[PDB]
Amino acid sequence: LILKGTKTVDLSKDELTEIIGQFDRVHIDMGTGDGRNIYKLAINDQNTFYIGIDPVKENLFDISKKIIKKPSKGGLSNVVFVIAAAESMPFELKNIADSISILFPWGTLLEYVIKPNRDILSNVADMAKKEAHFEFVTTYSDKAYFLSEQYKAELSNSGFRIDDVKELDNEYVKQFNSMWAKRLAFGRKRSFFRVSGHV
Numbered sequence: 001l002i003l004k005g006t007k008t009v010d011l012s013k014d015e016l017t018e019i020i021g022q023f024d025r026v027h028i029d030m031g032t033g034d035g036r037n038i039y040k041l042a043i044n045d046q047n048t049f050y051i052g053i054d055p056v057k058e059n060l061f062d063i064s065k066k067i068i069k070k071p072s073k074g075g076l077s078n079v080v081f082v083i084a085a086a087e088s089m090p091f092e093l094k095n096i097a098d099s100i101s102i103l104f105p106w107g108t109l110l111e112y113v114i115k116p117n118r119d120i121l122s123n124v125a126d127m128a129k130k131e132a133h134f135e136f137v138t139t140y141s142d143k144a145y146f147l148s149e150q151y152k153a154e155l156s157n158s159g160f161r162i163d164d165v166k167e168l169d170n171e172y173v174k175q176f177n178s179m180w181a182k183r184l185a186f187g188r189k190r191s192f193f194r195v196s197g198h199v
């Protein structure tokens with residue numbers, strides 16, 4: 001299931017593969033939210049195909065309608081929004097992504113990343129190519145935990161090899177365009193943590 005404007009339609013594996021062809025890279029943003037973050041990445045890189053995934057279609061209507069417009073009016077040819085959850089395991093997305101991100105997750109998705117939930121993270125890893133770079137950026141309250149051997153080993157069992165943990169600040173988050181990220185950036189001082197590496 002993908003969005004075309006405000007309408008949900010089906011995109012097949014063959015149709016997807018065809019679109020991917022005009023691009024050298026594929027990036028997946030899981031729990032993409034309002035689509036503004038992915039919109040900004042896409043407008044800045046026309047040789048990557050961006051796939052934003054979120055179970056809430058309603059919050060994607062604005063940007064989904066925007067990417068459908070003609071290029072002169074803000075349309076884009078390198079973005080698709082898939083309506084699905086981290087639990088969903090859509091077969092079409094298996095072994096497709098050069099990179100995968102989970103940015104500022106909340107609700108169930110946050111706990112899956114933080115706990116972590118090994119099975120769910122495995123579903124996310126299954127969407128990545130052998131190469132695959134990953135990036136999880138989290139915050140809760142407003143580094144030692146993510147650097148721990150236990151967390152490292154649990155991610156490794158899910159297919160994620162941590163190469164770096166970095167503590168980031170509000171200023172860093174100000175770069176993102178989602179309304180959620182802006183709230184996080186503009187509010188109280190908060191610690192943000194990026195756990196990145198390869199699949």
Ligand SMILES: Nc1ncnc2c1ncn2[C@@H]1O[C@H](CSCC[C@H](N)C(=O)O)[C@@H](O)[C@H]1O
Binds near residue numbers: 031032106110179
């Ligand atoms: N189990 C799950 N699978 C996929 N997405 C989920 C999820 N649980 C929550 N989410 C999504 O995660 C989002 C958290 S808020 C938006 C975060 C977004 N990446 C941003 O930076 O703006 C919500 O849109 C929510 O629908």
